[PDB]
Design a protein around this ligand. Structure first.
Ligand code: HIS
Ligand code: HIS
Ligand code: NI
Length: 465
């Protein structure tokens, strides 16, 4: 049958939709709302919604949607799914300040205590995908969604087997089966594609694009997106002072990284957000300056006889991150910083031990749904789900909290720019590059998604000629 083999980086433990975006990526689960190819929020599972006042969201769900096990998608099922996800995930919890949910038939009413203009947008987050909470199986193993492909088998951290859900609401899915295997090394993912072990791969190393373009049996897609690579500091280690972060920021050669590590498939970064976004007021671009870094390190007593030691974590999934780490190590030596690079296979798990790292290479989708609030809440607030280094500044918190209740879109842009300006002074993280989305496939594979948010991949139209 029409079977598709996919090789993905970033192995998962739990496959519950509130633990990872993989279920949405591979076509197993769907959120109430979704972004279209142009990045705009649209109803997906929702027929109609209204906001009669600024604390009330009334949703009417479509009446023709079933979960993969044949159960009807109803307002009660959505209520139970959202409530379970909020209680089991801080990412979900902190993004959804929901005070109550009522459900009757296909009608759902979601209330908040104060205005939260980004509520609809966050209900499009793949971590908010809807699953059947009454399913008897473990949601961490075989969640039941409404997507075109049902997860039938999961070998933890290794492989996911999916089968066509013939009654999928949007259309009869075009593939019979999908097999997803994890592979952290991008060079191995490319070899898998070249040997036909796999048919579709993500996160293609830049240094392999030309080879794929040359092959008439393969195709590579390279698109502008909203993913940013960065050096993330562990603020809980007292040695990681403002001067140390500033020194590290000046050791990075963003221009050189974009040109030679990313081979032009990236632009140097300033803030978390891609500079192509026209309302973003970016901080000034940092140029590498080893002498300035040495001077800043002298402020804390670091010299050649007594250098600063930094344990820098990296991971293979995003192939350029470890290449950047190597360059930072070499350049930092010139400034009296000895960097030890530790590559780990489970980055999210590893970083939980606050004593195990000083800084980490990282990559994140910083503006997946057209608003900067999400990033600020998840990265710059204490206990936000990607704030692994625990950056927090009361002055920044106040602005983020203000932003969260700000209705006027223009005022939101202004407050957001104020947050960027103020936070930038602290160097919470050093944003390195805004890098392009590179996906490759056998030429026989058609209609997979390579859109700027980098979340979606498989849908009901994806096929093998
Ligand atoms: N946010 C990082 C680490 C990660 C692992 N799994 C999911 N995310 C990245 O996407 O590269
Ligand atoms: N891997 C996705 C989602 C994520 C949540 N936490 C870590 N990663 C990203 O980096 O954008
Ligand atoms: Ni991630």
């Amino acid at each position: 049958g029409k079977d598709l083999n996919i090789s993905l980086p970033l192995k998962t433990k739990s496959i519950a939709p509130y633990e990872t975006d993989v279920p949405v990526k591979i076509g197993a689960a769907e959120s109430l709302f979704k972004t279209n190819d142009q990045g705009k929020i649209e109803k997906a599972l929702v027929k109609s919604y209204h906001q009669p006042n600024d604390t009330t969201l009334d949703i009417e769900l479509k009446d023709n949607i079933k979960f993969q096990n044949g159960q009807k998608l109803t307002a009660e099922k959505v209520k139970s799914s959202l409530e379970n996800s909020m209680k089991k995930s801080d990412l979900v919890k902190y993004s959804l300040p929901i005070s109550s949910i009522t459900a009757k038939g296909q009608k759902l009413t979601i209330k908040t205590n104060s205005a939260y203009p980004e509520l609809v947008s966050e209900l499009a987050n793949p971590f908010m995908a809807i699953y059947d909470t009454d399913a008897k199986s473990d949601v961490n193993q075989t969640p039941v969604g409404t997507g075109p492909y049902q997860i039938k088998d999961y070998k933890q951290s290794r492989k996911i087997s999916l089968s066509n859900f013939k009654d999928y609401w949007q259309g009869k899915p075009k593939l019979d089966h999908i097999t997803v295997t994890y592979q952290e090394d991008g060079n191995n993912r490319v070899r898998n594609l070249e040997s036909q072990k796999d048919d579709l791969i993500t996160d293609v190393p830049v240094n392999k694009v030309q080879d794929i373009e040359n092959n008439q049996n393969l195709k590579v897609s390279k698109e502008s997106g909203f993913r940013t690579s960065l050096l993330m500091y562990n603020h809980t280690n007292k040695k990681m002072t403002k001067s140390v972060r500033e020194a590290l920021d000046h050791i990075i050669d963003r221009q050189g990284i974009a040109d030679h590590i990313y081979q032009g498939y990236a632009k140097p970064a300033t803030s978390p957000f891609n500079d192509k976004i026209p309302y973003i007021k970016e901080p000034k671009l940092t140029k590498q300056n080893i002498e300035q870094a040495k001077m800043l390190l002298a402020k804390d007593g670091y010299t050649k006889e007594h250098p600063l030691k930094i344990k820098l974590i990296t991971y293979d999934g995003r192939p350029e991150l470890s290449k950047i780490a190597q360059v930072l190590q070499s350049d930092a030596k010139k400034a009296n910083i000895e960097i030890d690079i530790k590559s780990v296979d489970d980055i999210e798990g590893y970083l939980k031990d606050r004593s195990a790292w000083d800084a980490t290479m990282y990559s994140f989708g910083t503006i997946p749904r057209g608003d900067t609030g999400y990033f600020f809440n998840q990265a710059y607030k204490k206990d936000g789900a990607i704030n692994k280094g625990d950056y927090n500044n009361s002055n920044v918190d106040d602005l983020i909290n203000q932003l969260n209740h700000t209705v006027d879109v223009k005022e939101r842009h202004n407050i957001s720019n104020d947050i960027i300006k103020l936070s930038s002074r602290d160097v919470p993280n050093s944003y390195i590059a805004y890098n392009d989305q590179i996906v490759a496939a056998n030429s026989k594979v058609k209609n997979y998604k390579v859109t700027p948010e980098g979340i979606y991949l498989i849908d009901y139209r994806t096929t093998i000629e």
